[PDB]
Amino acid sequence: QIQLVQSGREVKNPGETVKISCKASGYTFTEYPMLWVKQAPGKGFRWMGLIYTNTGEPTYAEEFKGRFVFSLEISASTAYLQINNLTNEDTATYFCVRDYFISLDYWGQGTTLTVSS
Amino acid sequence: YEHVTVIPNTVGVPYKTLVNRPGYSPMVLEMELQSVTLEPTLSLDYITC
Amino acid sequence: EYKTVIPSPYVKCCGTAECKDKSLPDYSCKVFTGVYPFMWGGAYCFCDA
Amino acid sequence: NFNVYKATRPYLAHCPDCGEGHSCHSPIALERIRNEATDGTLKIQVSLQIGIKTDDSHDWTKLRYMDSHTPADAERAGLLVRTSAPCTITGTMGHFILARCPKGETLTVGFTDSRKISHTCTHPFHHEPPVIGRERFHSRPQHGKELPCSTYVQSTAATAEEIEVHMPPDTPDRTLMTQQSGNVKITVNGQTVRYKCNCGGSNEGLTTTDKVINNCKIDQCHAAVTNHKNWQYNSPLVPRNAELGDRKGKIHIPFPLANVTC
Amino acid sequence: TLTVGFTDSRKISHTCTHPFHHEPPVIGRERFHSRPQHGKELPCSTYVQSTAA
Amino acid sequence: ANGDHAVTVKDAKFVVGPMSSAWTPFDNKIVVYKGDVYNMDYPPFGAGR
Amino acid sequence: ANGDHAVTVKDAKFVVGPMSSAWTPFDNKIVVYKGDVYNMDYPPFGAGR
Amino acid sequence: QAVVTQESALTTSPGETVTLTCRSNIGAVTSSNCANWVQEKPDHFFTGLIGDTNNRRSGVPARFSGSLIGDKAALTITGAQTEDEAIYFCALWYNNLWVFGGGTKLTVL
Amino acid sequence: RVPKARNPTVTYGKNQVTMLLYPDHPTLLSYRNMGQEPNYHEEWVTHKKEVTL
Amino acid sequence: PGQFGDIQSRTPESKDVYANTQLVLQRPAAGTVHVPYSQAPSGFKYWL
Amino acid sequence: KERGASLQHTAPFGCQIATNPVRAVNCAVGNIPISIDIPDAAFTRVVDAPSVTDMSCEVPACTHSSDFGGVAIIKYTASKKGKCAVHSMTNAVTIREADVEVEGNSQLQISFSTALASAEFRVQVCSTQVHCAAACHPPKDHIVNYP
Ligand SMILES: *[C@@H]1O[C@H](CO)[C@@H](O)[C@H](O)[C@H]1NC(C)=O
């Protein structure tokens, strides 16, 4: 059974940084890419980019070609999402999703980020 | 230990010199020249078109 | 008067070619390295060297 | 007879000047020019075929040329040959043309397409007919004398000069590949395709239907069309199929020489 | 010489002519009449097809 | 190439120069145009023809 | 102050120079620091003390 | 900015066939857009249903299928039951980036 | 872009060189000595010719 | 190489031929598939 | 239209010229002195170098051309294996090789160049001297492409 495990909730202040994890289990990690999607509170989903597990080179979307940085740990079979220089507009819910051929089959449980002054 | 030699200014021909120091074995060196460049100092006066 | 006969070239990528001698008049052969041809649809062969 | 052209096809090649001062790949391209006659007649070889249709029948009002991956038909009335002032065409068959021309320093060919577009190609050349007798003259007179010279003959019978035809090579087309989300899709469009990608080790083979490759960019992949059913002339501008050539047949060169009086 | 002209909206033609002397300059140590296939490159200048300010 | 420079490669010092001749191919006035140099005595500023 | 310049003021042209002497107060080597100039024979590059 | 338009909700009865439609505001939907359909669990979880136009996810029963009708993408579900009262979404890919839909709610009475 | 000319035929004699030229369009030929005196010369060639230096 | 007698044959029916023209191959240009060369022109044509 | 020939085609001594920045390259006038300093760690003591006891010389061919047109054969007896230097003691003869390897009882081969009609010179190999002599023949080609 394929399962994706994400990190828990955390509360931040402006100017800080937050790290969100996504654990992979049940399939070979290097055979398929890892995708990320963002859902703002009260809004729909937004695409941000993906990273190739075989080479480690990431691609970013136009709206997020900024403080956002992707990373990978092959030995731990875990992908990471990093957001730096947090502001009050950065509160949202995040998910990690796999790409199998042209279909987005699976989904993560989600992580909640709350930023306030 | 200092050694002085003189070589002519011709490109592409090797030369040899002998170093002889009492108490030690002789040693032979080889040298070859690859480029020489000259560059003057300039100042501008005017232009035309 | 005389005539010159030129057959089509042979392009081998990711390797090395060789040719043998013949007894025809004024025979010539050579091998060049570092080629990267083009056609109307794109490059010919995958290897870039 | 035209039976010798039954299973052949035209081709594309390189041209050094295409009208504006830049190089291009054109359906009409130039081979060597022969000027062995003493009357000042020229013989030209090009890359298209004149007088034969696309279903292998004879019709003197048509010509066929090579479009992208398929031949098509066009009109004969658009064929022109010019060096300095315009020239005059005396006879055509297959790859070859006869013409009479003024003096000059260049040579140009051209024609019109089936969607109303023109093509040209230009090569350098030096043209100066010889002098016969002890006077230099510009046109044929009404009162004179006869001396020998030689010319070309308007006939299409079999001769002793021959050229060969071989098996065509592969054609690399980039357009077939596309880019989607984290995957590459290869389109067949009814033709056999050979592919090779370097992502994730190696993947090689042949295909006839649509196929998808996972975890790969549009780069690091190659495609080509690799099956053919026709033969083509072995120009020094087209790469060889294999280390040893495979002959399939041969065709003859018309218009031999003769003695005349001028 | 040099000549320009065009056609009217009632099928009438117009022309005008001026004297001029045309002789392009020479680049390199050889005189040639067309563009070759195998050769060398040297600096030169041209006009650009742009309609910007 | 003068007595005012020293370099060290593999724990050895080298000093080159000075040269034995001061000959130069340029005059006091030169004119430059896209890779060519000429010797010319141009007219003074404000005294054209 | 040399013969290669001409100026015109109120329809009159003036040409001045050249000078009769080549005396200068500077030597081949000088040193500068915040508004003072010194004459000094500084050591070669790579041969400090 | 391209957006996908979806209906607010649909009401049906048990045993019937439900077909949902979506369409972008910038042009027609063709085979190259690779339309995707996913379903939102009431527990605020997400699972995919239809990917690449006409490919059904493994384990999804035979009552789910999809196709393109005219200029609109369609998802058809047969044998509707009260268990199908979930949220369905439509997603489309144009050039560099994806485009997400607004979602819809299914009611079975 | 500019072209290049074809190779000549060279034969040797005692303290002299003989060359045969095959021009296709007007070309320039020049030569000079190395050392103190260069002794520069220059001429244009438009037909088949033979020279001795 | 470039005068009268560069190519010789004993009779119009023979198969053996003598030839003493110069033939040197040259490097291809970048991005083009072609075969350049350099060679002395015919001596029979010049003699005419 | 009337500027004429530039400096690259008229300059004496065979100089070359480039213009960005303006420079002159490879003009052949004069000579250059050089000074070099060698550390003490680079030398070998005379007790550790091998010694050579018996020497002979034989020359089978000589042609006094502008290239290296000589061959010589030398016999020796060496105390133990090692390296040695070779050097000429006359100014009219040049030798190509700089170092040789010696062991046991054997022979070595060298090549040289000279312009003398009758050859007589000495060769030094690790503090010993040998005498050679020969007669030389002239060449047959008129013009070459190197100094
Ligand atoms: C006529 O042609 C024949 C062969 O076709 C040739 O042998 C003969 O020399 C020619 N006659 C003249 C006068 O050129």
Chains D+F touching (3+ CB pairs under 8 Å)? no
Question: Do the Cβ atoms of K37 and F13 come within 8 Å?
Answer: yes
With beta carbons less than 8 A apart as the criterion, state whether H80 and H16 touch. Answer: yes
In contact, H37 and H76? CB cutoff 8 Å: no
CA distance D131 to D38: 9
**Residue nearest atom 4 in ligand 1 by C-alpha distance:** D258
D217 to chain A: nearest residue by CA?
A: A52
The strand pairing partners of H35, in sequence order, are none
Tell me which residue in D181, D199, D200 faces A99 most closely, judged by beta carbons. Answer: D181
Residue F26 in contact with partner chain B when CB distance is under 8 A: yes
Subunits with 3+ C-beta pairs closer than 8 A to K = B, F, I
**F44 contacts in chain G (CB < 8 Å):** 3-6
Are J22 and I7 within 8 A, CB to CB? Answer: yes
CA of residue D150 to ligand 1 center, whole Å: 9
Query: Is D16 close to ligand 1, i.e. is its CB under 6 Å away?
Result: no
CB H65 within 8 A of CB H76: yes
**Among D180, D187, D186, D188, which Cα is nearest to D215's?**
D180
What gap in Å lies between CA B17 and CA B4, rounded to an integer?
A: 10
> Rounded to whole angstroms, how far apart are CA atoms H47 and H50?
10
The torsion angles phi and psi of D225, rounded to 5 degrees, stand at -105, 125
- Report how far residue D221's alpha carbon sits from residue H23's, in angstroms, rounded to the nearest whole number: 33
Whether K10 has its CB under 8 Å from any CB of chain I: the answer is: yes
- Give A22's contacts (C-beta < 8 A, 6+ positions apart): A4, A5, A6, A34, A78, A79, A80, A81, A96, A108
Interface test with F, best of K1, K2, K19 (most F CBs within 10 A): K19
Contact I28 E35 (CB under 8 A): no
Is G48 an 8 Å CB contact of chain F? no
| Residue-range definition of the domain harbouring residue D47 | 13-169+251-262
Report the sign of the C-alpha dihedral through residues D137, D139, D144, D149, in that order: positive
In angstroms, what separates the C-alpha of I15 from chain K's closest C-alpha?
Answer: 7
Closest CA to K60 of K106, K117, K109: K109
Domains and CATH numbers, chain A: 3-115 (2.60.40.10)
- Residues 19 through 38 of chain G touching chain F, CB cutoff 8 Å: none
Closest ligand 1 atom to the C-alpha of D259? 1
Q: How far is I48 from chain J (nearest CA, A)?
A: 9
> What's the sign of the alpha-carbon dihedral I42, I43, I49, J1?
positive
**Closest by CA position to D64, among listed D54, D79, D77:** D54
> Is F8 near chain B, with CB under 8 Å?
no
- Give the three-state DSSP class for H38: strand
What residues in chain A have their Cβ under 8 A from chain H's Cβ atoms? Answer: 44-47, 61-62, 95, 101-107, 109-110
CATH class belonging to H4-108: mainly beta
Chain F, 12 to 41: residues with Cβ < 8 Å from chain K are 12-21, 23-26, 30, 32, 35-39
Residues linked to residue H55 through DSSP beta bridges, in sequence order: H51
DSSP assignment of chain I equals -B--PPP-EEEEETTEEEEEE--SS-EEEEE--SSS----EEEEE-S-EEEE-
- Matching residue, tokens 């090649």: D13
Cα–Cα distance measured from residue J31 to residue B10, given in angstroms and rounded to the nearest whole number: 40
Output b/e per residue, G18-49; b: 16+ Cβ within 10 A: eeeeeeeeeeeeeeeeeeeeeeeeeeeeeeee
Q: Which residues of J touch I6 (CB under 8 A)?
A: 38-39
Q: From the CB of D148, is ligand 1 less than 6 Å away?
A: yes
Q: Do G44 and F8 touch (CB under 8 A)?
A: no
For residue E44, the chain I residues in CB contact (below 8 A) are none
**I-chain residue closest to E33, CA distance:** I25
Residue of E nearest to I1 (CA): E41
Cβ contact (<8 Å) for B24 and K147?
Answer: no
Residue D57: CB within 6 Å of ligand 1?
no
Q: What is the 3-state secondary structure (H, E, C) of H48-83?
A: EEEECCCEECCCCCCCEEEEEECCEEEEEECCCCHH
Physical contact, G and E (3 or more Cβ pairs within 8 A): no
F24 closest CB neighbour out of B36, B38, B45: B38
Residue D236: left (phi > 0), alpha (psi -120 to 50), or beta? alpha
Look up residue F20 and give its two tokens. Answer: 């034995």
Identify which of A34, A100, A57, A52 has the alpha carbon closest to the alpha carbon of residue D216: A52
Query: Resolution for this model in angstroms, one decimal place?
Result: 3.2
Of C9, C39, C41, which has the smallest distance from its Cβ to D236's Cβ?
Answer: C9
Q: Do chains E and D touch (3 or more CB pairs under 8 A)?
A: yes
Yes or no: say if I32 and I42 are a contact pair by the CB < 8 Å rule.
Answer: no
Query: Do D235 and D173 contact (CB within 8 A), yes or no?
Result: no
Q: Which amino acid is at H66?
A: G
Contact K95, K130 (CB under 8 A): no
Which one, of A26, A22, A54, lies nearest residue A35 by Cα?
A22
Most C-contacting residue of D171, D218, D220 (CB-CB within 10 A), to test interface: D171
Closest-CA distance of chain B to residue F7, Å: 15
Q: Which residues pair with D124 in a beta bridge?
A: D106
J22 and I22: CB-CB below 8 Å? no
The closest residue, in CA terms, to atom 11 on ligand 1 is D259
Rounded to an integer, what distance in angstroms lies between the CA atom of residue A53 and that of residue J32?
Answer: 39
State the smallest CA–CA distance between residue J12 and chain I in angstroms: 30
Task: Tell me how crowded residue K111 is: count the other CB atoms within 10 A of its CB.
Answer: 13
Is there contact between B and D if contact means ≥3 C-beta pairs under 8 Å?
A: no
Residue D46 tokens, joined:
């090009």
**Alpha carbon distance D232, D7 (integer Å):** 9
DSSP label at residue D209: S
Q: What angle do CA F24, F28, F31 make, to 5 degrees?
A: 100
Distances (CA, A) of D27 to D109, G38, H11: 11, 78, 63
Burial of J33: CB neighbours in 10 Å, binned 0-12, 13-18, 19+: buried
Testing ligand 1's pocket by substitution, the residue of D146, D147, D159, D259 carrying the most ligand atoms inside 8 A of its CB is D259
Q: Is D200 on the interface with A (CB under 8 A)?
A: yes
Buried b (16+ CB within 10 A) or exposed e, I10-45: eeeeeeeeeebbbbeeeeeeeebeeeeebeeeeeeb
The minimum CA-CA distance between I15 and chain J, rounded to whole Å, is 23
User: Across the D/E interface, how many CB contacts are shorter than 8 Å?
Assistant: 17
Q: How far is I20 from chain K, CA to nearest CA, in Å?
A: 18
Residue minimizing CA distance to atom 7 of ligand 1 = D259
Q: Which residue has the tokens 């060290």?
A: F8
- Domain ranges within chain H, ordered by starting residue: 4-108
Chain K residues within 8 angstroms (CB to CB) of chain F: 3, 6-8, 11-13, 15, 17-20, 22, 24, 27, 29-39, 41
Distance D149 CA to ligand 1 centre (A): 10
State the CATH number of the domain containing residue D28.
Answer: 2.60.40.3200
Distances (CA, A) of J47 to A53, D30, G4, J38, K63: 75, 29, 63, 21, 44
Q: Classify the C-alpha dihedral H96-H7-H87-A19 as positive or negative.
A: positive
CB contact under 8 A, K5 and I32: no
Joined together, the tokens standing for residue C49 give 């060297």
Q: For residue J44, give the H/E element and its range.
A: helix J43-47
Instruction: Report the SS3 class of residue D55.
Output: coil
Question: How far from chain centre, in Å, is Cα K66?
Answer: 13
**Biggest alpha carbon–alpha carbon distance for chain D:** 86
